[PDB]
Every structure is written in C-alpha cells, then in structure tokens.
C-alpha cells in the first residue's frame, strides 16, 4: 500500500469543508461530518464523512491514513462500500472524504430497531425479514467487489457495515477512527487487538488472511444481523478453550430470526476448510434470489 501512488485527482481544498459533530472517534483518529461545498464533477453540496488523526497521533497513523486513501483510490467505486469522494493531501494534516450515511453502523440500528419495536408492549416502521436479507445481500455484494479486486478486508462485521439514504447497506472500516483499545471486542492476543470472535481460525492460528476468511467473518455478521445485533459467541469467554472449540468445528447456534436456509450459509461460512467456503458472488446471487 505504502508504493501506491495518490491520484491528485481526488485532491479537494480543506476550506471547502465545514466541520460538524465527530461520528466517532479512535485514540489517534477520528471521523467529522462536515459539509463540503463544490465537491465532485457536479459540484455538489452536501453532508460528508471526513477522517482525520487526532492531535495524538503519530508518523505512524498519519501513514496508515495515506495509505488507507491509496487503497480506496485503487479499489474503484461500487454502490455497497463506503466510497471515497475526495481528499485534503496539501497545506495541513491528512483529510480523508468518505460517503455520508445517515442511519451509522448497522450494529447500532439493529440494536436500536429492535428495542423500537419492543417498545410498545412495554410502554418509524418496523423491520421486516425482508430487510434483513437486503442488508445481508447488500453486504456480500460489496464483498464481492472488494473480492474481485483481491482485497482482504481482514475486520467484517455489523460495526463496520453503514447504512445510507434508503437504508442500502455499505461495507467500510473505521479504523484509526475506532476506539478497540476500550472495546471488548477486540481481545489482546499477543501484539495486537484482534476481532478473534469474527477471525477465521487459520487466521488465528496461523496468521492467514484471505478472501475465504473474510467469508468466514461475513457468517460471524450474517449471525449477528438474523439476531438483531447479539454479540457472537454470547457469555463466551476468549481463551484457550475457545480456541480450541473453534478449531475443533465448534459453531454457534442458529439465530432466533434466521430462517433454516440463511443459517445454513452460515454454517457453509464456517466451514473449517477455506476452499470449501462458498464464494461472495455465491452468497450474493443466492442472498438476492431471497430477498426477490
Ligand atoms: C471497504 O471499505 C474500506 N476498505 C478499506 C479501507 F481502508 C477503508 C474503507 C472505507 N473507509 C471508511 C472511512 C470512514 C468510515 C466511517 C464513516 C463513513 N461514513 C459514515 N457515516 C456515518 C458514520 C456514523 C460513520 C461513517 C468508514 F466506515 N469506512
């Protein structure tokens, strides 16, 4: 990533954006709405999502953000990942001008949505089936864009899934702009914080990432999105039992909203064989014939 080149292409003036609130935040970054003014050939006006370092970060993070910028720039377009629409290189620090959307991580929305719903029995619209496997088929389909480019993800899952106008599922990652160093999803495995209820266990045992272990990860959501937003593996501790578990084709139980079919390309997901994962174009095509 590092011998990528940037595209000036992109290049937008920092006084063209207006700052608003901070969408979320990290230890050494961050991500701001603003309003960026003139913004795309049709010199748009409109709310955007910039991620930037904090006044904590390092040469380090501001490497990692450059490249980040390159990766997207190299990756293309597509309508389910979080797009870059534009980036601030010159006359101060790094800016990095991503697609706005509305309703935040698709984790939070589920969670939310359900205790909507719930709500009048203990006290707009509610979801249905049907959205599930859209947001579920909107997400293999971004994943089958990034496969076809060979693009590891290396950290699917709910929290880095956004959802945009007409609730249309995006695959991204917040990154330096996300807090794992206080988030109990990221576990200390040796060096690093690491997803390990997402990982793949060649990943974790070995090191390995893939587009194969990224399906696996995609059945690790597909459980947390047909269970409207449980942590996997739920009042499971990480440790050395856990992983033995994994290892030895241990797999969670189907989800209380998840019909047999969509939890049977969970356990395909899972399969401790990575060739024998289905593919993302797979899932997409099957997912999308479901959701008509
Ligand atoms: C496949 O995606 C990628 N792959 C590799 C990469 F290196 C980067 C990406 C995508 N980069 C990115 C940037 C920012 C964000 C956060 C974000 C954007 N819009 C928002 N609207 C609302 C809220 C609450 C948050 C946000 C995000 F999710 N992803």
Not at 85 to 96: N, Q, R, S
Not at 172 to 193: Q, T, W
Request: aromatic fraction near 10%; charged fraction near 20%.
């Amino acid at each position: 990533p590092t011998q990528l080149p940037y595209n000036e292409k992109w290049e937008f003036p920092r006084n063209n954006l207006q700052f608003g609130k901070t969408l979320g935040a990290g230890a050494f970054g961050k991500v701001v709405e603003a309003t960026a003014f003139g913004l795309g050939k049709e010199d748009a006006v409109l709310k955007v999502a910039v991620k930037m370092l904090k006044s904590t970060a390092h040469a380090d993070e501001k490497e990692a953000l450059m490249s980040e910028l390159k990766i997207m720039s190299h990756l293309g377009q597509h309508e389910n990942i979080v797009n870059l629409l534009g980036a601030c290189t010159h006359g101060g620090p790094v800016l990095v001008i991503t697609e706005y959307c509305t309703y935040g991580d698709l984790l939070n929305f589920l969670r939310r949505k359900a205790e909507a719903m719930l709500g009048p029995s203990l006290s707009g619209r509610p979801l249905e089936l049907r959205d599930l496997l859209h947001f579920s088929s909107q997400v293999a389909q971004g994943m089958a864009f990034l496969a076809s480019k060979n693009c590891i993800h290396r950290d699917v899952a709910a929290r880095n899934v956004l959802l945009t106008n007409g609730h249309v599922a995006k695959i991204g990652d917040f990154g330096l702009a996300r807090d794992i160093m206080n988030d109990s999803n990221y576990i200390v495995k040796g060096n690093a914080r690491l997803p390990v209820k997402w990982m793949a266990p060649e990943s974790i045992f070995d090191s390995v990432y893939t587009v194969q272990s990224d399906v696996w990860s995609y059945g690790i959501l597909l459980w947390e999105i047909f269970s409207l937003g449980l942590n996997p593996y739920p009042g499971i501790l990480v440790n050395s039992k856990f992983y033995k578990l994994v290892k030895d084709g241990y797999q969670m139980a189907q989800p209380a909203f998840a019909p047999k079919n969509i939890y049977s390309i969970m356990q395909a997901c899972w399969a401790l064989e990575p060739t024998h994962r289905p593919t993302f174009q797979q899932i997409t095509s099957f997912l999308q014939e479901q959701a008509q």
